[PDB]
């Protein structure tokens, strides 16, 4: 699998367009500041679980690690992630273009994560 790391909606949209013909999995998480501090506790706890699940991904897939921005931006009800992708909580693990998605505490359960990356 090939990983792509992006920050913000613009970069995300760009990344998906360049892989329009591949199975895409996207992980939406809070951004870390210059100091490396994360405002989303659940995101910090879930990342290692999601990445461990990557060992189960089927060949030929794409994984997009997406930092959505700072807390004030995420809280804005009009931000692009909420309005365009219907992502209303972080962390969120989504199989792009499909209904399969895991949210918040679901991202901490290895079984659920594995089942999403499997097929």
From Swiss-Prot:
Q: How is it modified after translation?
A: The oxidized protein is reduced by TRXR1.
Disulfide feature: 40-43
Tissue pattern of expression reads:
Ubiquitously expressed in cell lines.
Q: Where is the active site?
A: 40 (nucleophile), 43 (nucleophile)
Q: Which GO terms describe its biological process?
A: tumor necrosis factor-mediated signaling pathway
Predominant cellular place of this UniProt entry's protein: cytoplasm
Residue ranges of domain Thioredoxin in the record: 38-119
Claim: Acetylation is one of the keywords in the record: yes
Give the matching Pfam families.
TXD17-like_Trx (PF06110)
**Oxidoreductase as UniProt keyword:** no
- Where can this protein be found? Cytoplasm
What does the UniProt keyword field contain?
A: Acetylation, Cytoplasm, Disulfide bond, Redox-active center
InterPro entries, A to Z: Thioredoxin-like_sf (IPR036249), TXNDC17-like (IPR045108), TXNDC17_dom (IPR010357)
Enumerate the residues marked as the site Contributes to redox potential value: 41-42
Q: Name one GO cellular component term.
A: extracellular exosome
Origin, by domain of life?
Eukaryota
Gene3D superfamilies to which the protein is assigned, alphabetical: Glutaredoxin
Family label: Belongs to the thioredoxin family.
Listed under subunit, the entry gives: Interacts with TRXR1 and DYNLL1/DNCL1.
Q: What does this protein do?
A: Disulfide reductase. May participate in various redox reactions through the reversible oxidation of its active center dithiol to a disulfide and catalyze dithiol-disulfide exchange reactions. Modulates TNF-alpha signaling and NF-kappa-B activation. Has peroxidase activity and may contribute to the elimination of cellular hydrogen peroxide.
Name assigned to this protein: Thioredoxin domain-containing protein 17
